[PDB]
Fold:
Amino acid sequence: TYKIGVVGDKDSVSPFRLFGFDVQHGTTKTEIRKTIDEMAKNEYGVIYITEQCANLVPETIERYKGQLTPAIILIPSHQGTLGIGLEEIQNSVEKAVGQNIL
Amino acid sequence: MRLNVNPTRMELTRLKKQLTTATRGHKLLKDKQDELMRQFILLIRKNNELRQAIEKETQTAMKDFVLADELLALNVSISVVEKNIMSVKVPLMNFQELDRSIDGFTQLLPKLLKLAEVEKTCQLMAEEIEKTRRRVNALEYMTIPQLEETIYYIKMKLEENERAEVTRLIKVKNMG
Amino acid sequence: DVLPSLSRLKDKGTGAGKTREDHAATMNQLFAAYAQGKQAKELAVVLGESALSDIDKIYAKFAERFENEYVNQGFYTNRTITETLDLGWELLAMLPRTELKRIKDDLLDKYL
Amino acid sequence: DVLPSLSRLKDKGTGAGKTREDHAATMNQLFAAYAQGKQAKELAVVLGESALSDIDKIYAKFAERFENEYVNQGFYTNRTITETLDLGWELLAMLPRTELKRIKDDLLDKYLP
Amino acid sequence: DVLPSLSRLKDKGTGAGKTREDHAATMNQLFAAYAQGKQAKELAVVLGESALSDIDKIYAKFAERFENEYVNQGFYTNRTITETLDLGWELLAMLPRTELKRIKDDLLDKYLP
Amino acid sequence: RRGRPIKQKLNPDVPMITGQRVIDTFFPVTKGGAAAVPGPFGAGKTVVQHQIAKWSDVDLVVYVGCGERGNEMTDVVNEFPELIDPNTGESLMERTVLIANTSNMPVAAREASIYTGITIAEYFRDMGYDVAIMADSTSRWAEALREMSGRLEEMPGDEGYPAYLGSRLAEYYERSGRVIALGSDQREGSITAISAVSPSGGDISEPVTQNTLRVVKVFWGLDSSLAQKRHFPSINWIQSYSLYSTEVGRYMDQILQQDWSDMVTEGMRILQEEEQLNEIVRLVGIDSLSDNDRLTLEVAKSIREDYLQQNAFDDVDTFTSREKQFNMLKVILTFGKEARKALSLGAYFNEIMEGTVAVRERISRSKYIPEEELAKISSINEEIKETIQLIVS
Ligand SMILES: Nc1ncnc2c1ncn2[C@@H]1O[C@H](COP(=O)(O)OP(=O)(O)NP(=O)(O)O)[C@@H](O)[C@H]1O
Ligand SMILES: [Mg+2]
Structure:
């Protein structure tokens, strides 16, 4: 049984608080990665993170792709996406296949 | 570039066996790489439509809430069973005025989790593809060539030695 | 090791009237199934338990039994040609009829 | 295969008065393009189409026409040095002028189709 | 390169009253860890660190520290045997107690940090 | 066949200036030193030797064409009287002696040609001069020995060479060096020996190469792979070495009053790291690399293309002065450092590349910058420091 962590702007991500999700509010590169690496230390299952927040920390994020857990999942803000989640799927498919196959 | 081995008859036989093994292993590693790839394509398509759908919906939920206090001060954790796809270890994830905006979030959770699961599985699937590619490649472009080049070298050397011996034996004989 | 071993005049000494009618066909089949079994074994190591077909797992077990029971008779065990032939059939019986492609159905129905 | 191939003495037999003034520059350029083209093909095989820049693809296509149209002439076709050089210029037109760095502007102006 | 190197007269010349009572145990232990660590380090260069086990990753880091710190001292560095044996332990401490099969429990209790 | 006697040998500790960046920088030969260039056909041994004969700062050059092509000796007799030192107006021919015994010339006379040259070089060395003797190629010399060995019916050594091959080679290389000459002046002189070795298949485990490497301190190892890629001189920077590197480094620091030896070391460190990284890029592709790793490849590429590669037939690329080499290497190494710092502050590889197209192009053209205006190479440093620093925003 693993925990859920959410990283994003106060406005967009606060309602996740109602489910008992450890919602955290980092805003600089230092805060996000510092807040992720502990979440991995406490065997979190999934960490949801905003795309705007995610864009600050590609180095810390790619460090866990190969791990079974935690799953790091990119979500929009209230403002939307930068296209990263969909581009990461885009990159991974062209890498595996020689696509685009979608 | 040839390997650092001594040109003996036994070494030649070793490398020749090691090479037949290497060749067969390379084909089997290519076969897997291709299997994982077509299994990957199915799942990555699932991931993509899923991510497009849950991006559009989480976005609306978030926008509603914002357009609507520490009323959010008052638990759900998840369960991870483990399964196997081909040979890859993969996660199985199960749950364990403004009221309209709060509800929309409740309806996202199931789709967010499935995504978490499908995205991870794809991620793990993709990594294992790279892992197999690197082995295939290390075999095709380094190991097999080195074996092949060392084998040809030792054949040649063993041949020069045999020639050297007959030269010396002819001279020895003729001390008479 | 059967694979690199060879008799160049075996045909002149086998079959109906000399051993039994099923001699050659079974030899050819055991030879192939053992080759296939050893390949299946390798596959097991390289791609893992899971990539193995159920038909493949059988060949694996066949090559194992073939070395351990057929080839491994002991230095003091004298087998008649008929026992040998019967043991081969017994070993071939692990496989589906669908796999014994190098034997006429005529012989499959007579010896199992 | 022009890559392992080499003539060591070649400049004593080319240039104005001998072949044409464009000779050495086209040679350095076609060679470089073909080498880069071939390296791109090598990349596509190992890692797939996707690993290539749009520019790599152009170069990869360059290599292929070079092989099929320039090198491959048939064993009964005689090409005068003029016909050869001119054909060199045509394959060069495939590439952005900005790419043709081994050739100076004066030649590019007179010959580049 | 310590692996192919040898001394045939090391037993009667080392130990309690000559160097220290842990000379031969640590010496043997270090060789075991180095030979294995060196094989693991080289795989990792070929197949990536990910192609290595959890503990072979440790053995590989050990072979780096062993080469870079222990064997590499410089041509103007004179280490007392006591400095050398003590450094040997600091490397061996990188490894889990279970790995150190070449050393008796009596000795581990006493020297291992 | 008898060495000219001397008072004593001295350490060869002053570097020769070849004007070849890869040689003077990473694999220097000192005056009175010995270097071998073993390499496969078409790699560039004859060209390296011609370059040195043309540019090195010795007093006199002795060129032995031993068992090689006729055209090459012809090339020197025509090209050298036309190659004019502008400071003094004398041609290279006024400081050159040529000995020629080509491959279809009498074979025995290959051995003769080597001894004639070395003896002549000893003689000028005795007068107080700095002499360089180039042997192209010592392998033809060894073949002459084997052929005579066969007629003599001797018992073969390695690969049919006679047993005395190793000592014949060692005897000749020991006739070179820095010396105090005989006479009351106690004047000093030197012979620097540069020999081509031409191994079958390019295999350097061959006895001629192996025996040579035993007595010479500099190894210029030519790579057929580099030559095919048109990377000349095709000196393989991983396998090559100069055992004069440490001493030449000390000497350069002092004459330049600069940390040259450190720059060289950093350059070799960079090139060594690229070989570790390219092993991965072949396997998995450039995409797998971290930004740090990405940059190392780009800096290494700069050393290779902007610095290591030198066109011997280009009027300006053909010789690079000591000062110019220091300047070109500074620029290349500077860009590396500045980016490394930019990466650690928070900038990414791709924004550093794009932001520096123009200054990188400037760096790649330094090799063509005229010797009278080295300041244009120098100003690249401030351009590097400023353009990267803007990007850091
Ligand atoms: N430093 C250089 N700069 C530019 N081009 C070069 C250089 N070195 C060699 N080349 C080119 O490559 C060719 C080979 O040089 P060459 O001196 O013939 O090498 P080699 O090793 O002496 N050949 P061989 O005598 O047959 O073993 C020359 O014809 C040039 O085309
Ligand atoms: Mg030559």
The interface with chain A takes residues 287, 290, 346 of chain F (CB under 8 Å). The first helix of chain F runs from residue 21 to 26. Chain F has 16 helices and nine strands.
